Structures are given as C-alpha cells and as structure tokens.
Ligand binder design. Structure first.
Ligand SMILES: *[C@@H]1O[C@H](CO)[C@@H](O[C@@H]2O[C@H](CO)[C@@H](O)[C@H](O)[C@H]2NC(C)=O)[C@H](O)[C@H]1NC(C)=O
Ligand SMILES: *[C@@H]1O[C@H](CO)[C@@H](O[C@@H]2O[C@H](CO)[C@@H](O)[C@H](O)[C@H]2NC(C)=O)[C@H](O)[C@H]1NC(C)=O
Ligand SMILES: *[C@@H]1O[C@H](CO)[C@@H](O[C@@H]2O[C@H](CO)[C@@H](O)[C@H](O)[C@H]2NC(C)=O)[C@H](O)[C@H]1NC(C)=O
Ligand SMILES: CN(C)CCCN1c2ccccc2CCc2ccccc21
Ligand SMILES: CN(C)CCCN1c2ccccc2CCc2ccccc21
Ligand SMILES: CN(C)CCCN1c2ccccc2CCc2ccccc21
Ligand SMILES: CN(C)CCCN1c2ccccc2CCc2ccccc21
Ligand SMILES: CN(C)CCCN1c2ccccc2CCc2ccccc21
Ligand SMILES: CN(C)CCCN1c2ccccc2CCc2ccccc21
Ligand SMILES: *[C@@H]1O[C@H](CO)[C@@H](O)[C@H](O)[C@H]1NC(C)=O
Ligand SMILES: *[C@@H]1O[C@H](CO)[C@@H](O)[C@H](O)[C@H]1NC(C)=O
Ligand SMILES: *[C@@H]1O[C@H](CO)[C@@H](O)[C@H](O)[C@H]1NC(C)=O
Ligand SMILES: *[C@@H]1O[C@H](CO)[C@@H](O)[C@H](O)[C@H]1NC(C)=O
Ligand SMILES: *[C@@H]1O[C@H](CO)[C@@H](O)[C@H](O)[C@H]1NC(C)=O
Ligand SMILES: *[C@@H]1O[C@H](CO)[C@@H](O)[C@H](O)[C@H]1NC(C)=O
Ligand SMILES: *[C@@H]1O[C@H](CO)[C@@H](O)[C@H](O)[C@H]1NC(C)=O
Ligand SMILES: *[C@@H]1O[C@H](CO)[C@@H](O)[C@H](O)[C@H]1NC(C)=O
Ligand SMILES: *[C@@H]1O[C@H](CO)[C@@H](O)[C@H](O)[C@H]1NC(C)=O
Ligand SMILES: *[C@@H]1O[C@H](CO)[C@@H](O)[C@H](O)[C@H]1NC(C)=O
Ligand SMILES: *[C@@H]1O[C@H](CO)[C@@H](O)[C@H](O)[C@H]1NC(C)=O
Ligand SMILES: *[C@@H]1O[C@H](CO)[C@@H](O)[C@H](O)[C@H]1NC(C)=O
Lengths: 253, 128, 128, 128, 253, 253
C-alpha cells in the first residue's frame, strides 16, 4: 500500500497522493510537506493505566522500526515504564541514542513493577505507535515517556504555560490477564487502583491522604482501598473517612 | 477519497507543539541556547472545515501503509518519506515527455496563445 | 553501452526474493504479523531478451564505481543511491531553461501545432 | 545579496583536500586499496574574483541557519542538506503549472517562434 | 566513476545513466528504480568452503561500508563464520544492529576455528560484497550468514518451499596458505575435507556414517579420510567401507 | 532561517537560495552542489592553545549534532583533547563510530590534563563547529583531532607533501579562568607555556633543549620558564642560556 497524503480541496481534507494530483495543485517547497503525530487520546480511547497497558504486548522475531514526525499534540496522558521480570532482569531496552521523552504531557503515568514479559519487545496490539520526541517507534523503551498515537502526512497550501505531573504506580503480573496496580502515595502508602480513577481524582485523593494524615506510620506497607460507593468521574477535553482493618489492608468509605 | 472520521470521539481542537527562526542575540549558539526541553513552539488550531477531525482519521488510516513500509525497510530510523514524496510528485508531472494540452502535462500556453493571437494582427493586419 | 556477459558461466534463471501490499486482517500490525524470516515473497524470471545474464554482468561491472562511491562517503549505511538518481534524472531534463524543439528539452508541441494548424482555418478561412 | 567579508583577516588561498575516479588496477578493491589516510586529493585555489575571501565569509554567515536547522532535527548525522536543496530547486521551477512567458516559468519558445514565423511563409506565401 | 544504471532498450539490457537518457525514456516513480543483489554463485565460481575462504582476507586501515539492496537471489551456498585467534580473541565483529543473515540459503556452511587474522576486518579479495538481509557489506560479521555477491541498479519499464541445511566445519590456520578443514559429523567424528566435496555428497556421507554406525564410540576424536578413488561430482543449476588405522586416523575406501 | 547557498554571478560570490534563482541559472546535477568546511584559522583567530581553549565550554541539556561536509582546508593548527576530572573520570565522550580525525594538520596540539568539566558536552562558545574527517560536530570528542571551522554550501558553475607534528601539552584547571598549561619536552621536562609561543618556536626550543642537554636528569619534574625578554613572533600564511633556581623551577634567559 502507498502511504496516503492529506490534501485540502473544496474546503475539506482529502486523502490522496502525489500521483493523483492535478496541475492546479502546487508544491513549491519541501516546507509544504509536513508530518504530524496525533494522540489516540483524541479519538476517545480510555487513558487510565489499566486500560492503556492492555493495548501493549510482548513479541519476538520482529525488528523495531522508528519513523520521525515533525509536529505533535499536547498530551493529557503519557506513560513511562520500568518493568522487570521476577528474576530482576529488564523487560524493556534502554532508549537508543537521540530518543527522548514525549515533550508535552500533563500527566506522566510512571509504572514500575514486574511481569513475565514473554517476548523481546513490547508492541502496540492495535498497530499504533509509541510517540517520543519527534520520533515514533513500534516498540516501548525503558523509562522513556511516550504518548500512544499515529502519524499523518500532509501537503500544506502555500501561504498558556506547560505543567507536568508524575503519577507513580506499582504493578504485578504486568502484561497478562491478572495484572494488579497500586497508586503510590509514598514509598509505604498505596491505594488499590481502579480503571475508574482519573488523574485529578488520584491527585485529589493523594492530597487528602497527606493532609488528613493517613499515610503509613510504620515500617510496613499500607494499602488503602476505595469502595465503589464514591464517585470519581467523558473525555478530558469536554470536562470521607478511612479505617484500618488488617502488608496492612484498610478501606476508604 | 474524502476522509470520513469513524472514531468513537474527536477532540476538535489541536493544541500542537513543533520546532521553529529569527533568533535573539546569541540564542542560536548551542552552548548558549535552550536545552532540549525548550526548543518548542506551541499553537492552537480549531476545527474549521473539519480539518482537525479529518486529520485524526487520516493519521489513523495512514497507519497500515506506514507500518507495511516500515516492515519492508531496513533503515532503523526513517527520515526520507516526505523527501521521496516530493521526488515522486516531480516524477509524476515531469518524468516523461510533456505533451502540451495533454491531461498529464502542466504547461499553460494561455498567454502565449494571446501573444500570437495578437500576432494575427501582424502581417494581414497590415497587408497593404 | 550494451552489456556483454564475460563470466565463466551464467545461471539463466533468477529465483529471487524480495519484500512486498494488501494485507489480510491484522497481519499488518507488527505485534501480530510475520517475523523477520516471513516477510519475503519469491518469484522466478527466465532469460528472455538475455536480461538475466545481462543483469549478472551489470552487477559485476557496477562494483568498481559502487566501491569507489562507498570509499568516499562517510555514511556508515547508504540508502540514498536510487533517490539521488531520481533527482539527477530530473535535473538533467529540467535543471535549466527548456528550449522547445531543442534536443535536451522534453516537451512535445505535436498536438499544439495541430491546434493552431486547425486555427489557420480561423480568419482567412472565413475572410469574407 | 552580495557577500561582504568582515573578518579580522582573510587567507586568500584555499589549500584544500577532498575525496575523488579512474582507479589503477586493483586499487578500487577495499582489501587492496588505500587506508583512510590515503583517499584524499589536494588542490590550491587563489582568490580570483574574491571567491576565497567571499567563501570564508559565506561559511561564517551560514552558521546561524545551519545550527538552527541542526537544533530542530532529530537525525544524529545529517547528510541530506544538498539533496533537499536540489529537490527545492526543482519544486521552485516545476512545482506548479508553468505559464509560458511568465517570469517564474523556464521554457524558451524562441526557436519555436522562428519555426512558425517561418510558417507564416506557408499558405499566404503561396496563396495563388 | 559514476554508478551505472541498467535500462532496457531494443529488447536488450543496456548500461546507461540518468544523464544519458532520451526524452522517450520515462521515469514516473521512484518505484521504477530498483537495486538487486546477484550471487557470485551464478557466475560459476567454486562454492566449496576451501575455494570460497581463499577469496577473503584481513586488512586494517579501511573503514567498513554498507549499502542496501532491495531484492536478492536464492542462494545454494551461504557461509557463517566463527573464527578466533589462537589466544581465543574474536577475529570478526558482532553483527551491527539491524544486520541479519541472508534470507534464502539452501546450504549454510558454518565454519568455526582459528587463524592469525592479521587485520581488523575481513574483506573480499576480488572487491565483491558480503550480502546479508537486504544489506551488502564490504566486510564479514561474526556468526552472520551471508552470500557472496554484487549489486546492480535498474530503471524498470513502467507496467516451492524453503529448506535450509547447516553444514558445520572446523578450521585451523584460517585465512592462510596452510588452512585445513574438517567436516563435522558429530562433536567427535570428522571427515577430512576436500574442495571436490559437494554439499549433497557431504550430507550423503554424513548419513551413511550414522546409519552404518561409523561414528566415534570413544572419548576421543575420530577423523575419517576419503581416498581419491571414489567420485563425488558442473554448476549447481545444470545438475564403500571404513577401516581404522590410527586423535584417531582412518580411511574410507 | 533558510540555509544560504553560495552562487557566482557577475564575477562575484553571491549568497542566495534555490528559491531565488533565475531561469538562466542551471543546475543539471547534484554534482554541482558542494559543501565546504573552512577553518577559523583563515579568518585570523589566535591559534595558540591558551587562546583556542577559551573558545570552548561545557554545557548540559543540548544533544550533540553532526553534519557532513565534502571538502576541507589544510589546517596549520589542530587540537586533540584528553581531559579528565580530578577524580579521573573522562570529560569527553569517545569518538562515535565512523568519526575520524581531521585529515590535514601541520601541527596537532595534543592536550592532556584535568578540569572541572561542568557539563555533559564541550561546545564552541562562538557557535562554530569542530571539524573532523568530513564530519562537523557541535561537540568535542575525546582524543580525536579536529580543526575549528564553519561550513558553506555552494552551487558550482557547470564546467607538495603532507607532514604533521604532534605538540604535547599538560593542563590544569581546564576550561576555567585559572587554566595553566605546560609544553611537554619529555615526560619529566616541561616549559611553562605562553600565548605568545608559536608552534615553530616550541619545536625550536624543544630541539635546543635536547641538543644543549637541558632535559631533566633526575627522577623529578623539571619545569623551564621563559622570561619575556626574548622574542618568539602576523598570521601563519603571510609569514640563550638556562639556569636552575628551585618539582624544580628554572629560567631560560
Ligand atoms: C483506527 O481507528 C479504528 C476505529 O476507531 C480502530 O479500530 C479499533 O481496532 C482495535 C484493534 O486494532 C479494536 O480492538 C477496537 O475495538 C477498534 N475500534 C473500533 C471503534 O472499531 C483502529 O485500532 C485504529 N488504528 C490504529 C492503528 O490506531
Ligand atoms: C567481475 O567479473 C570478472 C570476470 O569473471 C571477475 O574477474 C576475476 O577477478 C579476480 C580478481 O579480482 C581474478 O582472481 C579472477 O581470475 C577473475 N576472473 C576472470 C574470469 O577474469 C571479477 O572479479 C568480477 N568482479 C567482482 C567484483 O566480483
Ligand atoms: C563570524 O564572524 C564574526 C566576525 O569575525 C565572528 O564574530 C565574533 O563573535 C564572537 C562571539 O561569538 C566574539 O567573541 C568576537 O569578538 C567576534 N568577532 C568580531 C570581529 O566581531 C563570529 O563569531 C563568526 N561566527 C562563527 C560561527 O564563527
Ligand atoms: C511559524 N510558526 C510561528 C507557526 C507555525 C504554525 N504552522 C504549523 C503548525 C504545526 C505544524 C506545521 C506548521 C507549519 C506552518 C503553518 C501553516 C499553516 C497553518 C499553521 C502553520
Ligand atoms: C488554517 N488553514 C488555512 C491551515 C491548515 C493547515 N493544516 C492542514 C493542512 C493541510 C491538510 C490538513 C491540515 C490539518 C491542520 C494542520 C495541522 C498541522 C499542520 C498544518 C495543518
Ligand atoms: C509485486 N509482486 C507480487 C511481484 C514482484 C515482481 N517484480 C519484482 C521482482 C524483483 C524485484 C523487483 C520487482 C518489481 C516489480 C516487477 C516488475 C516487472 C517484473 C517483475 C517485477
Ligand atoms: C519481464 N520484463 C518485462 C520485466 C523485466 C524486469 N527486470 C529488469 C528490468 C530492467 C532492467 C533489467 C531487468 C532484469 C530482470 C529483473 C530483476 C529484478 C527486478 C526487475 C527485473
Ligand atoms: C576532480 N579533481 C581532480 C579536482 C577537483 C577540484 N574541484 C573541487 C575542489 C574542491 C571541492 C569541490 C571540487 C569540485 C570540482 C571543481 C570544479 C571547479 C573548480 C575546482 C573543482
Ligand atoms: C575557478 N572557478 C572557475 C571555480 C570556482 C569553484 N569554487 C566556487 C564555486 C561557486 C561558489 C564559490 C566557489 C569558491 C571556491 C571553491 C571551493 C571549493 C569548491 C569549489 C569552489
Ligand atoms: C501527593 O501529595 C503530596 C503532598 O503535598 C505532594 O508532595 C506529592 O508531590 C503528591 N504527588 C503527586 C504524584 O502529585
Ligand atoms: C484471563 O485470565 C485467566 C486466568 O484467570 C487466563 O487463564 C485467561 O487466559 C485470560 N484470558 C485471556 C483472554 O487472556
Ligand atoms: C522511594 O524508593 C525509591 C526506590 O525504591 C528511592 O529512589 C526513593 O529515594 C525513595 N523515597 C524516599 C522518600 O525514601
Ligand atoms: C498513626 O500512628 C498511630 C500511632 O503512631 C497509630 O496508632 C495509628 O493507627 C496510625 N494511623 C494511620 C492512619 O496511619
Ligand atoms: C547428519 O546425519 C544425522 C543423522 O540423521 C542428522 O541427524 C544430522 O542432522 C545430519 N547433519 C547434517 C549437517 O545434515
Ligand atoms: C604458500 O604456503 C607457504 C608455506 O608452505 C608460504 O610460505 C607461502 O607464502 C604461501 N604462498 C602464498 C602465495 O601465500
Ligand atoms: C557440541 O559442542 C558444542 C560446542 O562445543 C555444544 O554447544 C553442543 O551442545 C555439543 N553437542 C553435543 C551433542 O554435545
Ligand atoms: C565401535 O565400538 C567398538 C567397541 O565399543 C570398537 O571396538 C569399534 O572399533 C568401534 N567402531 C567404530 C567404527 O567406531
Ligand atoms: C623534540 O625534540 C626531540 C629531539 O630530536 C624529538 O625527538 C621530538 O620528536 C621533538 N618533539 C616534538 C613535539 O617535535
Ligand atoms: C577570572 O578568574 C577569577 C578567579 O581569580 C574568577 O573568580 C572569575 O570569575 C573569572 N572571570 C570570568 C569572567 O570568568
Ligand atoms: C610517557 O608517559 C606516557 C603516559 O604517562 C607513556 O605512555 C609513555 O610511554 C611515556 N614515555 C616514556 C619515554 O617513558
Ligand atoms: C644534569 O646532571 C648533573 C649531574 O648528573 C646535574 O648536576 C645538573 O644540574 C643537571 N643539569 C641539567 C641542566 O639538567
């Protein structure tokens, strides 16, 4: 298949190619050609860490491929993965030279933990790309922030503030059907994570935990659980008390 | 073909980042200029003519051909797609003999008909 | 020049492999598709017009110039030879002013002679 | 613009090195040929037409735009600048419809005016 | 020298270049340009391991160079080299990222052993290339299957089953005038190798050794020798009893 | 800014671009396009090691970039740096694959020593490039000979002996305001270096030290000093007795 090219005709975006243009179409400079990365976010996909990770999977025998893109979209949700095997060996390769994190992320979901990782590289199960800094890869690199997305190619017609917040999670059984996630409050206080939980709810609950003083006050690990009664939540652009009952389990009602 | 967005949703606004231009003072010197995080400009485009929602569908539909291209190349990192499109554009229009007034031939003799239609009034204009 | 095979022998059939196209289902998704070993298509070409034996001689005779090119470049891996040939093809035909009916100028006004040879029957056709 | 050398000094002679060509015997075979140190030819150019002193100023003034280009690319090593210039040259002249006798259109019908100015002596030459 | 280009004219292949074409010649797409790798095999060169290795040699001071090619020929004979120095250090470099073995090899002649290796890289003494997976290199990489060949460039006119067998050898004095080869039957049974021996003869003799039960049945190394009386053999496309007499020497008459 | 292009018109060099040419300008081959590296030397900059090193500085956060160039100028002065931190860790990265020293250097000023090196890479403070073998880099690589220079791009109109001498120096406080340099005569005899000292004066003084026999004749370090009275010196292309008085200090009057 020939790689499609976007062209504006009759006040609408058309898919075409350079072999299918008419003499009136004018290309006077390579500046008129542009590559754009668009975020899966903008098509309405679930962005919570549980939903997002199930779109990725390990596979051997397929060499990684990288394609550049010149312009991108600000992301609400990005991901940054540090996954090892139970024996402690790395599941993802170090970022190759010159590959940097995606440059505009409102929330960086940083996931550390373990899984079997039954394959040499982690690919997108839907054929999408992992978008880094103006480089789109078929595979995930270790510890390197990315947005899920896809790339478009265009013929142009010739003519505030950046904040970012890292949300940390721990995971077991990563990349399987029995994966479990914990939202990290400090190194000893965690909240059991649900797909329902938005970033701002997580940041809210984190803040209430610190201020109300419900962090672990022990050597041991304190895991909070949020029972279904309370509401947490629509796409991003269009929009209590705690008791211990024991590791140390508890409940936020 | 015209592009039909068939996604669950569409964010109709494109808050984009890209790289730039006319520098200020010494800011073009790598030693003095911005770090990797600070080379980006930002803009906002709205969905006039449905171009943003169309663009999202276009990127989505491009993926199959792009992936098949990446599968078949041995370059680890591909930077040449747009340059090759530019070459193929030129080869389409100028890769063979251009037969004037043919449909695959982009030369207009509109004025140069007029320049010799004015030259019908050259000799048998003044055919005294 | 025409190519003269001067090898000890020639295998007149080309059992070739290459990469491909229209995928089946999800097979274009790298996660689901073939491994490195399974991306190849095969074909067989016979020696019609002596093209196979000529091709073997051509590859052989290309080696000196190719090696001298590789000696002089600093790219570790060279992917741009064919793209540069395409550019040089265009520069040869269109790199300067195209003087119509000159030998280095690829525009045919054959029909556009006819379109104004029909226009000799325009005014002194009907010169009443 | 014309180039004005504004350097503290200028060495008006260019003792240059570059890579080459017609080899001798087996010298094109990498196994038998020169090492990295021995692939260079040398020459000497003097400052006729002030080209050497102009060239030094040109390289100096190119640096800002070149550095800004390097800041914005993600290629670790850039080999494509001249090839892209060649493409942009072609797109400038042939990227749209070429209106004959327009200022941005590089086709000369000088002889092909003569070929039909000779053809005014075709029919009402011999209009017996 | 300018890189020649193959073009079809007057029902024959011509060598030309883009600067030497006439307006009738039409190039309407970069798809019309193609690079092809052709195998030295197809020109009639001896493909036995002794003959093939003497075409390769070590040299310092010359940086390796790689050029891609898009299409190749199925090979009868490929080679895969694991050579070290007597002190055990590697003679060949590891395959760079993204360089894989030649994809179509009826016989992979895998050679392990030692030589002096008096140079940083192994080059083709006749100026040919080592063909890998759509990448042609001036030098040999360690443990990476290749075919010897050359590359052609073409302007096109605009319009079963794969089996592979690994034959293992051991070598001493590799890359010299006093190189000696052994065909490996198992880790303790070897046959002294001659240039006369075709792949199918080697596979035949191997099979007869297993079935007749003439493998080494000891801790020690059993080397069989084949005296000149028997026939073994023309290019590939156009076409007993054993006694010990001793390491342990023997003879196959 | 668009990258300027040099073009000859009216018997003078003009700066232009492919978008600013007239139909009479003819580009018939990519061979007509050429990149040239020009040496800062040729603009009259001081080339002595003290002056040259103060044009370079360390900086973090800026990825290195490399651009190729096809033709260069013979240099009188090149530099080759081996700088470590006081704790012995390397300040400069190893030369990437395929990056070799500048090919034509009358004098290679080889500097070894220490500095703080307060940044990941050493850049040119004036925005110039470090020229290597047909590759121009924004940063300095360890132990790799370079010339300082800049790159030009040209549209052409379509138509002895090489000697090199290594001068070795040692440095402390490299890359600061309190840097000190020593010219190395042997591993135990050094001369305190001044910006005034030309290469040929250094080679002269070295020779006189050997012949007069004023090298260190001890286990210890002998540092000679040259008082201002004597003359040493204009650009390169247009043109005694010793007493000890003590490490071991001395004076060359
Ligand atoms: C392009 O858009 C379509 C439609 O949204 C995506 O189709 C999805 O495909 C995956 C499998 O790849 C399914 O699990 C989803 O259920 C599909 N969604 C719908 C609404 O049909 C497709 O994945 C997108 N392509 C890429 C590369 O992102
Ligand atoms: C191209 O073909 C010629 C002819 O077959 C090859 O010539 C051989 O060259 C080597 C030395 O390089 C000699 O040892 C052979 O004796 C030559 N053979 C003949 C028949 O003359 C040449 O090597 C080939 N070139 C490449 C790069 O493979
Ligand atoms: C191009 O040439 C100008 C003029 O020689 C250089 O200007 C110098 O700039 C540095 C700072 O970058 C100052 O320290 C010098 O005093 C300037 N000299 C003069 C005479 O003005 C400029 O550096 C050169 N550009 C490059 C990239 O080398
Ligand atoms: C030039 N700086 C300041 C603005 C860039 C905005 N610009 C953008 C924005 C994103 C990607 C490419 C481009 C190219 C220029 C173009 C043309 C028409 C409308 C928008 C845009
Ligand atoms: C506002 N008008 C005039 C410019 C539209 C440019 N625009 C274009 C241009 C052609 C085709 C699609 C699109 C989508 C929007 C997009 C995103 C990034 C860079 C350029 C573009
Ligand atoms: C397209 N799949 C199915 C067949 C490819 C065969 N094909 C081949 C075969 C080898 C290399 C290139 C090419 C290009 C296409 C071309 C044109 C004319 C005759 C043969 C060939
Ligand atoms: C059969 N006819 C019509 C197609 C010939 C295409 N053929 C061509 C085309 C031009 C020049 C030489 C050659 C040799 C054969 C070869 C090998 C690989 C891909 C393409 C080609
Ligand atoms: C070809 N060998 C032998 C000489 C090269 C001299 N040559 C040079 C010299 C340096 C860089 C490029 C070029 C291209 C050829 C050109 C054109 C006009 C005048 C000088 C030069
Ligand atoms: C002597 N005449 C006719 C050739 C000038 C070629 N010359 C040119 C050509 C165009 C613009 C500037 C320059 C400067 C000198 C330079 C340096 C390296 C390679 C080519 C060139
Ligand atoms: C959680 O709240 C604490 C308390 O202020 C804050 O310091 C910390 O940065 C927050 N973490 C996240 C991920 O926002
Ligand atoms: C879901 O998890 C179970 C384990 O409880 C596993 O056996 C099953 O294969 C998983 N389903 C899928 C579709 O992977
Ligand atoms: C939390 O743990 C990580 C690694 O286990 C460590 O790097 C970090 O310093 C710890 N934070 C605190 C506050 O102890
Ligand atoms: C906090 O600490 C007190 C004693 O230090 C303990 O009894 C209590 O259960 C802890 N509460 C929480 C919410 O951690
Ligand atoms: C040699 O024969 C044995 C016996 O069947 C077989 O298992 C082995 O794979 C053969 N080796 C080769 C290189 O064909
Ligand atoms: C052949 O081998 C001998 C050793 O017996 C060696 O001395 C000679 O140099 C070799 N010949 C060639 C041409 O290398
Ligand atoms: C033969 O030896 C190799 C290496 O010496 C080893 O990897 C292989 O397992 C051995 N095979 C058997 C059957 O022992
Ligand atoms: C096989 O083994 C027997 C005893 O185990 C030994 O005597 C004989 O020589 C061996 N023969 C071969 C062909 O290995
Ligand atoms: C200094 O002089 C000695 C004496 O001949 C010579 O051997 C040495 O190479 C010279 N060093 C330099 C850097 O020229
Ligand atoms: C010069 O050196 C002094 C130390 O004596 C230092 O404090 C000062 O910052 C330096 N000047 C500059 C401009 O770096
Ligand atoms: C001088 O020292 C260097 C490293 O300290 C060493 O490599 C070199 O061999 C020494 N030279 C002599 C003559 O000892
Ligand atoms: C040389 O050596 C002698 C004794 O070995 C010593 O007294 C003298 O000071 C030395 N002179 C120089 C110039 O090194």
């Amino acid at each position: 298949r020939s790689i499609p090219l976007g062209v504006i005709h009759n006040s609408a975006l058309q898919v075409s190619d350079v072999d299918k243009l008419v003499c009136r179409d004018k290309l006077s400079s390579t500046n008129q050609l542009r590559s754009v990365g668009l975020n899966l976010e903008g098509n309405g996909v679930a962005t919570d860490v549980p939903s997002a990770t199930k779109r990725w999977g390990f596979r051997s025998g397929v060499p990684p491929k990288v394609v550049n893109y010149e312009a991108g979209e600000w992301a609400e949700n990005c991901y940054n993965l540090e996954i090892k095997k139970p024996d402690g060996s790395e599941c993802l390769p170090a970022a190759p030279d010159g590959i940097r994190g995606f440059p505009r992320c409102r929330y960086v979901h940083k996931v550390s933990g373990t899984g079997p990782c039954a394959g040499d590289f982690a690919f997108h199960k839907e054929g999408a790309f992992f978008l880094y800094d103006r480089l789109a890869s078929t595979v995930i690199y270790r510890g390197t922030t990315f947005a899920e997305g896809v790339v478009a190619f265009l013929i142009l017609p010739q003519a505030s503030g950046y904040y970012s917040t890292t949300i940390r999670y721990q995971a077991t059984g990563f990349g399987t059907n029995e994966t479990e996630y914990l939202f990290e409050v400090d190194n000893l206080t965690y909240v059991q994570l649900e797909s329902r939980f938005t970033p701002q709810f997580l940041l809210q609950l984190n803040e209430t935990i610190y201020t109300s003083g419900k962090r672990s006050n022990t050597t041991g690990k304190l895991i909070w659980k949020v029972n279904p009664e309370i509401d947490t939540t629509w796409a991003f652009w269009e929009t209590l008390s705690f008791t211990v009952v024991s590791x140390x389990x508890x409940x936020x009602x | 073909e015209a592009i039909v967005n068939a996604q669950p949703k569409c964010n109709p606004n494109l808050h984009y980042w890209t790289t730039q231009g006319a520098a200020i003072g010494l800011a073009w010197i790598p030693y003095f200029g911005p770090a990797a995080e600070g080379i980006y400009i930002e803009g906002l485009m709205h969905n006039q003519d449905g171009l943003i929602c169309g663009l999202r569908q276009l990127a989505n539909e491009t993926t199959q051909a792009l992936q098949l291209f990446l599968r078949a190349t041995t370059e680890l990192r591909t930077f040449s797609i747009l340059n090759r499109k530019a070459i193929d554009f030129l080869l389409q229009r100028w890769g063979g003999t251009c037969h004037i007034l043919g449909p695959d031939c982009c030369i207009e003799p509109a004025d140069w008909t007029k320049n010799i239609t004015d030259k019908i009034d050259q000799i048998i204009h003044d055919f005294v």
